[PDB]
Design a protein around this nucleic acid. Structure first.
Lengths: 75, 481, 81
DNA sequence: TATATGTATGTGTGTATATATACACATATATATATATA
DNA sequence: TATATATATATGTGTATATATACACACATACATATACA
């Protein structure tokens, strides 16, 4: 059967947008952990959802985009 | 079934045709409601983004397709394209031009054929190429497509022929693929093979075929993967094989080494490996439309798959051989050899090699070959070399074995002591001899570096009899011609 | 590649063996690098932006790595080599 | 799962064949290494 | 361009040592390749 999808349902079903929509092994996955006033970058040896990290990432890069866009400006 | 996939690439035009059931020649209701005109299924399949039969993929589905996007990506990068598809009662021809801007109405006739063909001209100029393609661009693109077809031919089932520009594609096995990729770095090499099976459905329905070559002249680890038909370049299946091989390699390295302290990692384990992995994996996901990288939990393989131990053992053996060899290759890389001026060139067969017995003999011969005008009719270093026989030659007649193989031929395999003799290694490297040659024809007898070996030995009974007879016995036992 | 070319040069210099041939894996397997900044005109391989796409010559034509950094790096790496 | 059973290495003796290496000592020369100048 | 290192070579008469190959055969150590099975 040939189906036509909209953006919404597509993005919920398809991994092409943000990565896998379930937990997979992400090679090089790191996080920052505090050990007595010291930041350490440590590996996270546990599967996680790439799309879940992407929704954080998309907003964060929108913010840093705005920062560059405004850095030579008045406001 | 699909019995063939014909791919062609000629004068810029690219074409692909398969012969299973065609795409349904039928009106698409919802697509027509959207378009407010009559739209058939092939037009949705080729012109409607996010549309296809894989929008709702099953967890067990091993098709590469998932997004309903790829075909329209082809159309959008086509100056012109032709979709032709027949279902056994009708044929359907639709032309899709100007990067999906002009979608001509289709033409539907009766036909009893059954097939699907996409034919198109890319926008080479818009994409950075010459118009028409240059000699180099054309040859590069043809080679790349030819490669992709070979990969299909290894992934596709056994009732399906893959054609490229009408010739069938040879490489129906991962061994064929391995040989193709290593024909230059490592011709005539050993191909480790494995069929990696799983015990639980759906994984047990899809064995992974694997072929690997292991060579000291491989500089880094390297894999070729066709997974679900996709030539992807990153995925935890590779890491599964890498880690398994490494664990075994570390175990046997610490076993075989009596140093017992050195610690090697995955780069040491795997940098001499080239692997081809071909097959289907259900339930995988990708990191984008390109499908460069598959996404999966590593434990899928730890739980379900097992690499056959014979393959692991073979691989570990080859790799640990290389490891110890690399540790002691610095002591292999000092013989006494005076090269003639014309050794190995255009007049190489005009040259002699005066193999003397020690170093005082070389003092005599170098005194003799330098009488420049006291001997105007004599020889000199323009066509004469020198080398030392190192005392007494080893014999090979007591240090070799004729072993009988299955085809009915006894091959003559040497000893590890005879192989590592520094004197005979010197004359083989100097003369350029080859052990598996026979030198029956003159076309083979002109591939050497000198024209004759000349034994300048002593005339006392020891040097005239013993080491000259052992030199004759060596040359008789390996090259009587 | 830049660090490797310098590392190979100084390795053959410092070594009096003068025959051994090392590649990029030998050169670089003891390196951890952080690179931060902006590059105009790049493209990606998908929405995720895991991989940027660019002609290598952009850097060969336009950018230069300061030699003091290259020298320091090559020194540390050849010490390990 | 123990058993043989035919494979392959491996020092060892006398009389031969052909080589290799560390150190001391005095003084003139050398080729690249180094400051600090800047 | 300069003043300054620290290592580096060669000569005669001395002080010390190392190592490859042939040749025969009784003997020692290492599998490994089957063959009943189990």
């Amino acid at each position: 059967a040939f189906e036509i999808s909209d953006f919404k349902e597509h993005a919920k079903k398809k991994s092409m947008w943000a990565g896998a929509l379930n937990k997979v092994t992400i090679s090089g996955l790191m996080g920052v952990f505090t050990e007595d006033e010291d930041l350490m970058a440590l590996p996270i040896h546990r599967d996680h959802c790439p799309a879940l990290l992407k929704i954080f990432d998309e907003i964060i890069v929108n913010a840093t985009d705005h920062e560059r866009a405004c850095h030579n400006k008045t406001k | 079934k699909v019995t063939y996939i014909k791919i062609s690439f000629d004068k810029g035009v690219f074409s692909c045709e398969n012969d299973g059931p065609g795409i349904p020649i039928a009106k698409h209701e919802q697509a027509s409601l959207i378009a407010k005109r009559d739209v058939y299924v092939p037009e949705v399949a080729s012109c409607h983004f996010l549309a296809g039969t894989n929008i709702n993929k099953a967890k067990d589905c091993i098709k590469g397709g998932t997004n309903g996007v790829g075909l329209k990506l082809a159309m959008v990068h086509s100056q012109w394209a032709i979709l032709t598809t027949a279902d056994g009662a009708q044929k359907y021809v639709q032309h899709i031009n100007q990067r999906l801007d002009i979608i001509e109405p289709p033409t539907i006739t009766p036909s009893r054929e059954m097939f699907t063909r996409i034919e198109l001209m890319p926008v080479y100029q818009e994409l950075g190429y010459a118009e028409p393609l240059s000699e180099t661009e054309q040859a590069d693109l043809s080679a790349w497509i030819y490669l992709r077809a070979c990969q299909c031919a290894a992934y596709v089932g056994k009732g399906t022929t893959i054609y490229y520009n009408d010739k069938p594609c040879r490489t129906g096995s991962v061994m064929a693929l391995a040989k193709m990729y290593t024909l230059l770095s490592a011709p005539n090499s050993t191909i480790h093979t494995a069929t990696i099976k799983a015990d639980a459905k759906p994984y047990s329905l899809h064995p992974l075929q694997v072929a690997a070559v292991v060579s000291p002249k491989f500089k880094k680890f390297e894999h070729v993967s066709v997974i679900n038909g996709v030539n992807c370049v990153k995925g935890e299946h590779v890491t599964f094989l890498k880690k398994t091989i490494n664990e075994m390699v570390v175990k046997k390295f610490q076993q075989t080494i009596k140093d017992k302290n050195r610690k090697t990692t995955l780069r040491d384990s795997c940098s001499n490996i080239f692997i081809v992995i071909v097959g289907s994996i259900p339930g995988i996901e990708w990191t984008g439309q390109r499908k460069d990288e598959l996404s999966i939990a590593e434990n899928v393989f730890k739980t379900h798959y097992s690499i056959p131990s014979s393959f692991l053992t073979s691989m570990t053996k080859s790799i640990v051989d290389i490891l110890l060899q690399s540790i002691s290759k610095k002591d292999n890389h000092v013989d006494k050899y005076t090269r003639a001026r014309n050794a190995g060139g255009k007049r190489a067969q005009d040259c002699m090699l005066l193999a003397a017995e020690g170093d005082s003999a070389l003092s005599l011969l170098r005194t003799g070959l330098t009488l420049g005008k006291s001997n105007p009719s004599g020889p000199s270093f323009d066509f004469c070399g020198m080398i030392s026989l190192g005392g007494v030659i080893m014999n090979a007649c007591k240090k070799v074995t004729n072993i009988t193989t299955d085809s009915g031929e006894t091959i003559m395999v040497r000893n590890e002591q005879l192989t590592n003799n520094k004197v005979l290694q010197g004359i083989v490297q100097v003369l350029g001899l080859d052990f598996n040659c026979h030198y029956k024809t003159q076309e083979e007898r002109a591939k050497l570096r000198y024209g004759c070996i000349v034994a300048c030995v002593d005339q006392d009974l020891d040097g005239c009899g013993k080491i000259l007879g052992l030199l004759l016995a060596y040359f008789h036992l390996f090259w009587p011609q």
